[PDB]
């Protein structure tokens, strides 16, 4: 009110809003998988000279089923991260499957040194494929040594980017650390080049109910209270909307159940007080709010709480007599300062009851009069005002 003294009455103040308690995420376990399991895990790979190139589209690039492996030493992407892949969608993916010398794992990396690399696998200048290092000695090992994966490719002409050494007799487990055969796997994908046809995985968490929480259901983010509902969603229907087109029901992706969404309790806060001179005691009304949520006279406890159709009153004694209205509240409730002294909330009385002595043949006639001079004030005009707009 911008005043050090406030007159008797009830004044609106800062709105009361219930803050969320915890965050809840729900999603399906896992969806269809892109053909990455074979490239990242298989029995036989293609030849080094016949380096494989497979177009991957129309699937879900799920990194959960791919990152569950623990043999990788350092699988991180410079510009992105696997964890945030969940909501990242690809255009097309390319997989390079071949078996080469272990020491050539870095030779496959972009911006390398050595003419033995581009002889079999040229290094493009804009390769976004994140390098991956993993052990495949058992898979690439042969009892006598497999020399079929030779590096005879020695073309003299310069090699264009994607236009299409033999220090060991063969791939044998006897090779020392860093020299055993390794299968180089790189998931090289380009974005904004082909129509979006591949998307990422999702993550799930536990379930809670009957609390103001921030929910994320299949990418639908919101805040509210999740309750068990009797609505019967159709087998395919997921969300539910009200007349005003606002979310009101949601189907849990994990459990085939329907949950009602109710916005967290909120409402205006009014302060009922007599004149500052009369006393500094006040009561607080939370409008249209069950006072099972007011703890979250500003304190958790509500002293003598009093539920009323116009919200919950805190700090006002509930008197069960009737008087004339002093400070209105709502739904026929009025608060006033009375006798030690305290603020009392009661049901307003419309006036003294009267039973006129009406009868067959009884008439009441006055025998005297009074002259009453009563005032009446009416506004007639208000101050003129012109404005220089410019």
């Amino acid at each position: 009110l911008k005043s050090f003294t406030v007159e008797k009455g009830i004044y609106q103040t800062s709105n009361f809003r219930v803050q969320p308690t915890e965050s809840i995420v729900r999603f399906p376990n896992i969806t269809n998988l892109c053909p990455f399991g074979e490239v990242f895990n298989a029995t036989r790979f293609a030849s080094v000279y016949a380096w494989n190139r497979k177009r991957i589209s129309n699937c879900v690039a799920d990194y959960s089923v791919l990152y569950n492996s623990a043999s990788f030493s350092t699988f991180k992407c410079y510009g992105v991260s696997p964890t945030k892949l969940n909501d990242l969608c690809f255009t097309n993916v390319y997989a390079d499957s071949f078996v080469i010398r272990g020491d050539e794992v870095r030779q496959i990396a972009p911006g390398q040194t050595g003419k033995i690399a581009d002889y079999n696998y040229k290094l493009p200048d804009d390769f976004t494929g994140c390098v991956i290092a993993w052990n495949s000695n058992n898979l690439d090992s042969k009892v006598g040594g497999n020399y079929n994966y030779l590096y005879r490719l020695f073309r003299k002409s310069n090699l264009k980017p994607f236009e299409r050494p033999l220090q060991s007799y063969g791939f044998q487990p006897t090779n020392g650390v860093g020299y055993q055969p390794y299968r180089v796997v790189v998931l090289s994908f380009e974005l904004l080049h082909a129509p979006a046809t591949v998307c990422g995985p999702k993550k799930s968490t536990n379930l809670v109910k009957n609390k103001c929480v921030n929910f994320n259901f299949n990418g639908l983010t919101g805040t509210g209270v999740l309750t068990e509902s009797n609505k019967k969603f159709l087998p395919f229907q997921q969300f539910g909307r009200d007349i005003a087109d606002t979310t009101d029901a949601v189907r849990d992706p994990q459990t085939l159940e329907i949950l009602d969404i109710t916005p967290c309790s909120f409402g205006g806060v009014s302060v009922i007080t007599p004149g500052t001179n009369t006393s500094n005691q006040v009561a607080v009304l939370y409008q249209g709010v069950n006072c099972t949520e007011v703890p979250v006279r500003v304190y958790s406890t509500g002293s003598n709480v009093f539920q009323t159709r116009a919200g919950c009153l805190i700090g006002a004694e509930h008197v069960n007599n009737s008087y004339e209205c002093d400070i209105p509240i709502g739904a026929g409730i009025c608060a006033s300062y009375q006798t030690s002294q305290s603020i009392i909330a009661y049901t307003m009385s419309l006036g003294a009851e009267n039973s006129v002595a009406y009868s067959n043949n009884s008439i009441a006639i006055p025998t005297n009069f009074t002259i009453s001079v009563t005032t009446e004030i009416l506004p007639v005009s208000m101050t003129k005002t012109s404005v220089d707009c410019t």
Binding site: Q12, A331, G332, L350, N354, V356, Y358
Partner: protein, 365 residues
Amino acid sequence: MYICGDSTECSNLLLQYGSFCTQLNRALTGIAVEQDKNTQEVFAQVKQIYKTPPIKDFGGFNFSQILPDPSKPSKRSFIEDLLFNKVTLQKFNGLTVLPPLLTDEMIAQYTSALLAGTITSGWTFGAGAALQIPFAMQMAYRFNGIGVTQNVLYENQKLIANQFNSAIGKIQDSLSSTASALGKLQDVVNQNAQALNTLVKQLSSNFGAISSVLNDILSRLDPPEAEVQIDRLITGRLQSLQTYVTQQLIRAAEIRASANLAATKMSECVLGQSKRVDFCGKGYHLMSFPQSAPHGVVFLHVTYVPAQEKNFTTAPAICHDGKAHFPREGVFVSNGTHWFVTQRNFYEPQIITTDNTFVSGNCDV
């Protein structure tokens, strides 16, 4: 909450616009207080809560259908319940409805007090202490007010009571049958609901932004672009709020005009007889009975209507002995052979005598 529901960044951006939110809240609070003031002015017009005696010997008039029925949990009369049944018909985004200060039960109590005061003390209770008077005598006073001699009522009391009872029954049947009578209240409710619905629907508009979802904008855009989009959304939603509040202010102004008219009708018809033509109903107003309806009032205007007009031959004065006699009150009428003097609103011929006429001038004028 409406503009920036649960968004610290959007709230911070909205802080720059100044006191628009405070102005809108103040306007809505003014309207809300004005509603309670309107109901108070219309209904709370009695210093005391009167009540009719148990013995309903009202000279044959039957007010059962308008008097309260204690049996029902809500002490509302038959017609009041009829109206309540006939009248028939967002929390997410900061929209709240505050209950009225005066509940339906207490409004019904006010109406019952007014009705009991009327039937038991005429119009005295509206001008001072309520003074009892038999309802037959009260109706005689009403007839004298409209200009018909009280002997008319005292001699046609049974017929008048039967006509009033039949009229009450007919109005009850009409209200029970057709719902078009309460179109005014239904339209008020529908307009308010439609305004709120449009306000809520406005939240699903881009206003040129990338999306209508603040959380989506924030998550998918970096500080600067998110700020630009959120500012666009803020402008759109603030325009929506201002439009809604202006419409509400105009509608509240018209509703206040209606409430003032209703209060004037109460004071000038229920609390007394009115000589203003077609103000308390069509015809010569005799009385009015109030009834409470959802978010409004209903007046049952009881009026007197001449029915069976018959012509006669009339003259302005009469020549007796060179002196021009004029009717004191009434008119001179003849059926063709004789001359009589009768009151102007009910054919009651009487012999023309010196006590019915006053002399003035002579014949030749």
